[PDB]
Amino acid sequence: QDWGNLKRYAEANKELVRKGKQKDRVVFMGNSITEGWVANDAAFFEDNGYVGRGIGGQTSSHFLLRFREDVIKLAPALVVINAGTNDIAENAGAYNEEYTFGNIVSMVELARANKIKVILTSVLPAAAFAATQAIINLNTRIINYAIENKIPFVDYFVEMASSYTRDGVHPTLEGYKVMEALIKKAIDKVLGS
Amino acid sequence: QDWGNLKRYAEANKELVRKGKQKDRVVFMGNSITEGWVANDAAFFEDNGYVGRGIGGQTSSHFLLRFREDVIKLAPALVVINAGTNDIAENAGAYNEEYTFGNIVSMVELARANKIKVILTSVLPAAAFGWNPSVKAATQAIINLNTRIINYAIENKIPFVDYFVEMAQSPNGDLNSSYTRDGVHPTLEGYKVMEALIKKAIDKVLGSGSGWH
């Protein structure tokens, strides 16, 4: 058993460490949208020196368990954390806003303890404006925390289903292309500052 | 679902916060050893203002998941971490020293981010019994993990309480046979050895809490 799925990237991490620490490496942590980003446009990551560490179906608890191996040990300059909303889908009745939010705080604090800059992101489903309440309440709580602690963040807007989404939840390839320009702006500002 | 077992102490944490803030609270994070310590010797915790947050069978990965709710949100002065016994025992999966040691470091960094002092501790010696061939390899893993912990403690000026050296026996490095009956918990005599060490170390960090006596 390997509940956190540290196995998923363990060999890939080994191959990275063998190739030497890298300037301005950015790690993307997240669930299926982050996983699907690499699947849909691997060259965006490879060309930019970005490392995708997304795993579909996972919660912020899994992210916290993988954080040291899949982020800290890669010695990145910056980590993009897409976490929060997916716990509501995945945990359904057991979702607890305090626990999810606390996992995000924990990863921010681990990143900062290791001199890794942070961008928090969220991909807000279109029909989020049943779980609307939980999604908005969590996103607003993260926004307030981000402002109070000067954490840059990016709220990707998913249109109503559109050449950018089929279901109003997940990006198409074209939807990923427009998320790329936006996240790059955020990253290059954070790395330059 | 609640793989970390945040449910175990959720209600007890609520009732603790209801009773108000305590300046010198110490939280003990741990597995069956720590859970059974409160069961066998509640007075040691109650008399000294310590809070036990042990859960049986749990690994350092569980502890990392529970750390914010069961340590940070209790606003303690200090957290005692004893982690590793079940990582090595493999009751919850294969053992990886890097993963386990890294979970301990992550807890230390979360503690420090929250102005909580840390005492790190040795994983206890493995108990030899019957026809269990895994015990000699577990002892080598325990000693190697404790070495990673103690060098990290030295590097970061963190106190390290060496239960192991006081509870192991020669030549095999396994548990003093007197110090366990069930192979899961120290006996009370074993807990008393651990109490003298950890209380001395807590009092060194926080000062004497004896009051007027």
Question: Which spans in chain B are helix H?
Answer: 7-18, 32-40, 42-48, 60-70, 85-89, 97-113, 135-155, 163-167, 188-206
Q: Is B9 domain-assigned?
A: no
Dihedrals phi, psi of B141, to nearest 5 degrees: -60, -40
Alpha carbon of A43: minimum distance to chain B alpha carbons (Å): 30
Instruction: Find the angle CA(B140)-CA(B142)-CA(B146) to the nearest 5 degrees.
Output: 120
Q: Is residue B158 part of a domain?
A: yes
CB of B82 within 8 A of CB of B33?
Answer: yes
Which secondary-structure segment (H or E) carries A104? helix A97-113
Q: Is residue B10 part of a domain?
A: no
Q: Residue A145 and residue A96: Cα distance in Å, rounded?
A: 17
Cβ of B1 and A91 within 8 Å? yes
**Phi-psi region for residue A168, left (φ > 0), alpha (ψ -120 to 50) or beta?**
left
- The verdict on residue B17 lying in a domain is no
Chain B CA closest to residue A87? B1
Given a contact cutoff of 8 angstroms between Cβ atoms, the answer to whether A75 and A18 are in contact is: no
Kindly give, in sequence order, each residue whose CB lies less than 8 Å from that of residue A172, ignoring residues fewer than 6 positions away: A163, A164, A165, A166
The encoded tokens of residue B38 equal 């409160």
CA distance B181 to A161: 64
- State which amino acid sits at residue A54: G
Cβ within 8 Å of residue B116, ≥6 positions away: B71, B72, B76, B77, B78, B79
- B77, B23 Cβ separation under 8 angstroms: yes
Method: X-ray
Q: Which range marks the domain in which residue B46 is found?
A: 22-206
Distances in Å between the alpha carbon of B2 and those of A58, A101, B62?
13, 15, 10
Cα–Cα distance measured from residue A45 to residue B77, given in angstroms and rounded to the nearest whole number: 43
Sign of CA dihedral B207, B160, A108, A185: positive
The DSSP bridge pattern shows strands B78-81 and B26-30 to be parallel
| Count of domains forming chain A | 1
- How many other C-beta atoms are found inside a 10 Å radius of the C-beta of residue A186? 16
The resolution of the experimental structure, rounded to one decimal in Å, is: 1.9
Q: Is residue B8 part of a domain?
A: no
Contact indicator for B65, A61 with CB cutoff of 8 Å: yes
Asked if the structure places residue A6 within a domain, the reply is: no
Asked if B40 and B91 count as a contact pair (C-beta separation under 8 A), the reply is no
Q: Is the dihedral of CA A34, A39, A41, A46 positive or negative?
A: positive
> Tokens in use for B53?
């947050």
Q: Is the dihedral of CA B145, B147, B148, B152 positive or negative?
A: positive
Which amino acid belongs to residue A174? E
Residue-wise over A79-114: b if at least 16 C-beta within 10 A, else e?
Answer: bbbbbbbbbbbbbeeebeeebbbbbbbbbbbbbebb
- What's the alpha-carbon Rg for chain B, to the nearest Å? 16
DSSP character at residue A60: H
Q: Which of A101, A80, A105 is nearest to A27 (CA)?
A: A80
Element (H, E) at A192: helix A173-192
Residue B110 sits in a domain whose CATH number is 3.40.50.1110
C-alpha–C-alpha distance, residues B165 and B99, integer Å: 24
Which pair of structure tokens corresponds to residue B57? 């069978």
Q: A98 to chain B: which residues are within 8 Å by CB?
A: 69
CA gap A32, A55 in Å, rounded: 6
- What residues does B78 pair with on adjacent strands? B26, B117
Closest CA of chain A from B149, distance in Å: 16
Residue A61 and residue B2: Cα distance in Å, rounded? 10
Sequence-distant (≥ 6) Cβ neighbours of residue B212 within 8 angstroms: none
Q: How many CB atoms lie within 10 A of CB B147?
A: 13
Q: How many residues appear in chain A?
A: 193
3-state SS, A105-170, equals: HHHHHHHHHCCCEEEEEEEECHHHCCCHHHHHHHHHHHHHHHHHCCCCEEEEECCCCCCCECCCCC
List the B26-30 sheet strands across, edge first: B50-54, B26-30, B78-81, B117-121, B160-161
Sign of CA dihedral B99, B101, B102, B106: positive
Q: Would you state the structure tokens that stand for residue A104, as one six-digit string?
A: 């995000």
Sign, CA dihedral A158-A156-A27-B58, equals negative
Does B34 reside within a domain?
Answer: yes
Per the CB < 8 Å rule, is A112 touching B113? yes
Dist. CA B16–CA B63, nearest whole Å = 19
H or E element, residue A40: helix A32-40
User: What would you report as the CA-atom Rg of chain A, rounded to the nearest whole angstrom?
Assistant: 16
Shortest CA distance from B99: residue in chain A: A69
Tokens 């915790």 found at: B45
Integer Cα distance of B122 and B162 in angstroms? 5
* A150 CB burial (10 A radius; 0-12, 13-18, 19+): exposed
The answer to whether the beta carbons of residues A76 and A27 sit under 8 Å apart is: yes
For residues B145 and B147, give the distance between their C-alpha atoms in angstroms, rounded to a whole number.
Answer: 5
**Does a structural domain hold residue B164?**
yes
CA distance A124 to A127: 9
Q: Which residues contact A150 (CB under 8 A, 6 or more apart)?
A: none
> Which of helix, strand or coil describes residue B133?
coil
Whose tokens are 């489903």? That residue is: A125
Structure tokens given for B146: 């404790």
- A89, containing H or E segment: helix A85-91
Tokens of A192: 């330059």
- Degrees (nearest 5) of the Cα angle B125, B168, B136? 55
Tokens of B173: 């490095």
Alpha-carbon span A42 to A61, nearest angstrom: 26
Q: B70 to chain A: nearest residue by CA?
A: A99
What are the residues of chain A with a beta carbon less than 8 Å away from any beta carbon of chain B?
Answer: 1-4, 6, 61, 64-65, 67-69, 73, 91, 94, 96, 98-99, 102-103, 105-106, 109-110, 112-114
**What is the CA A117 to chain-centroid distance, rounded?**
13
- Residue A171 DSSP code: B
